[PDB]
Design a protein around this ligand. Structure first.
Ligand SMILES: CCn1cc(CN2[C@H]3C=C(c4cccc(O)c4)[C@](C)(C[C@@H]3C(=O)OC)[C@H]2C)cn1
Length: 286
């Protein structure tokens, strides 16, 4: 009741803040060509995915007060497909961003040649295709169930096998592989930063490189912190059939809320970790 309305209020606050912040990030990235760097290309996709995953929160939150789904199965389809597209889009974007830094640092000669913004958009597109390859089935099997109590929105499968096959294809192809690629790149960029006195030659350029890479790593770590709980809980709850409990329900709600709040946390990180973003957030906001 009171607790439920506080949960709804928190979800509404997260919805508004995340949508506004991610819209602002997309606009600031699109505003100027000097802000169209390769890192900004992937930041654009990350913010786009966050905005898409946040736009459905009013529907996802109104349900707590009714136990019913009046919005429609089409909207149910879209919301359920968004919930899955978000994980793949964002993690793949971060993996591509962390791989790009390796080309920038350890192979600067070919870095500028292969990191054109057209190539960045191409690796954004490929991320989209690979995510769609496991996202489209979610929408194609997502439909509402006309329960006796109240209509509900849920997935369907033909259902103990594929329901877990999708979970494995997420935990493997969308968490562990991208994390393992990010680590494999960073473990070598970090050594190339120290073993090389100056990377880009120009001291200002080297400082900009070591700072943009730090922001990329910070965003990557923020995403990992925010999303590891939900992935791990999703895997474990199915693995050991954890039964219903007060602590279990609270932890589930907290994990989902943190995963959704990452979307509105990203704007804070961009504001607190980049001179360009910080200046623009006041420039367009005044
Ligand atoms: C508040 C509305 N709500 C959402 C849910 C469930 N969601 C949460 C977690 C999921 C998930 C995460 C990891 C692995 C996996 O296989 C599935 C979703 C795909 C994404 C949702 C989320 O939090 O990321 C924005 C979906 C099933 C239940 N209620």
């Amino acid at each position: 009741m009171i607790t439920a309305i506080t949960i709804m209020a928190l979800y509404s606050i997260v919805c508004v803040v995340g949508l506004f912040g991610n819209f602002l990030v997309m606009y600031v990235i699109v505003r100027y060509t000097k802000m169209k760097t390769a890192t900004n290309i992937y930041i654009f996709n990350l913010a786009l995915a966050d905005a898409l995953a946040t736009s459905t929160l009013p529907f996802q939150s109104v349900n707590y007060l009714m136990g019913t789904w009046p919005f429609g199965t089409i909207l149910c389809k879209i919301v359920i497909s968004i919930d899955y597209y978000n994980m793949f889009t964002s993690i793949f974007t971060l993996c591509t961003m962390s791989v790009d830094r390796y080309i920038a640092v350890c192979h600067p000669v070919k870095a500028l040649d292969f990191r054109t913004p057209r190539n960045a958009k191409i690796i954004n597109v490929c991320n989209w295709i690979l995510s769609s390859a496991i996202g489209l089935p979610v929408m194609f099997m997502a439909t509402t169930k006309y329960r006796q109590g109240s209509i509900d929105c849920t997935l369907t499968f033909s259902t103990w096998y594929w329901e877990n096959l999708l979970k494995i294809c997420v935990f493997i192809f969308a968490f562990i592989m991208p994390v393992l690629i990010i680590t494999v790149c960073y473990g070598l960029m970090i050594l190339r930063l120290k073993s090389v006195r100056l990377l880009s030659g120009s001291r200002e350029k080297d400082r900009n490189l070591r700072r943009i890479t730090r922001m990329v790593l910070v965003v990557v770590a923020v995403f990992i912190v925010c999303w590891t709980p939900i992935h791990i809980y999703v895997i474990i709850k199915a693995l050991v059939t954890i039964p219903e409990t007060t602590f279990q329900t609270v932890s589930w709600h907290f994990c989902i809320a943190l995963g959704y709040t990452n979307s509105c946390l990203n704007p804070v990180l961009y504001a607190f970790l980049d001179e360009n973003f910080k200046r623009c957030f006041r420039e367009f906001c005044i």
